[PDB]
Amino acid sequence: MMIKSFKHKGLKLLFEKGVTSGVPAQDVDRINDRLQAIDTATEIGELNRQIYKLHPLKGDREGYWSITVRANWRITFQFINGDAYILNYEDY
């Protein structure tokens, strides 16, 4: 599952060039790890760890999934052809 694109510019900056301007300072490594996990997994189910609280997003955007970063904040992405296209950092 390779990552192909992003919606939250703030994540793309940390993933591509390694710049923390668009993410909270305390959450930098935690997000960098979850992203490395999303890029490394061959299929959803390798991203099913209890700490992630991985659940699908249904009704609106069926096929998109949600992983938890800390407390409320979450990382949301679409899964297609064994890959992960859109990548966003938001709440619920």
């Binding site: 591509e16 935690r30 490395q36 996990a37 390798e46």
Partner: protein, 95 residues
């Protein structure tokens, strides 16, 4: 997509254990290895081996393959630009 930082999986695990409130010693006893071993793993001083990956998956979830794949991408990053491949021919006809 060329991630800029590729962390050793041990260091990722260490962060998760901080986030889960699990000590090295508790982790060791759970997965069946010595605290020495956990320390070196978590510090990124030693590799996540196949046999560790079996134990870790049982405690932390995902599959052993996932854990080993993290270690491989990491091993590869460190080896980037350390091996001259410029003289190796790519066997086969050009597409």
């Amino acid at each position: 997509m060329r991630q800029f930082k590729v962390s050793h999986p041990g260091e990722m695990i260490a962060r998760d254990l901080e986030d889960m409130g699990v000590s090295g010693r508790r982790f060791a006893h759970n997965i069946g290895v010595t605290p020495a071993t956990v320390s070196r793993l978590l510090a990124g001083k030693t590799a996540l081996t196949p046999s560790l990956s079996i134990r870790i998956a049982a405690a932390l979830g995902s599959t052993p393959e996932f854990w080993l794949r993290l270690q491989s991408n990491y091993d590869l990053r460190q080896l980037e630009n350390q091996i001259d491949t410029s003289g190796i021919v790519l066997y086969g006809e050009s597409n």
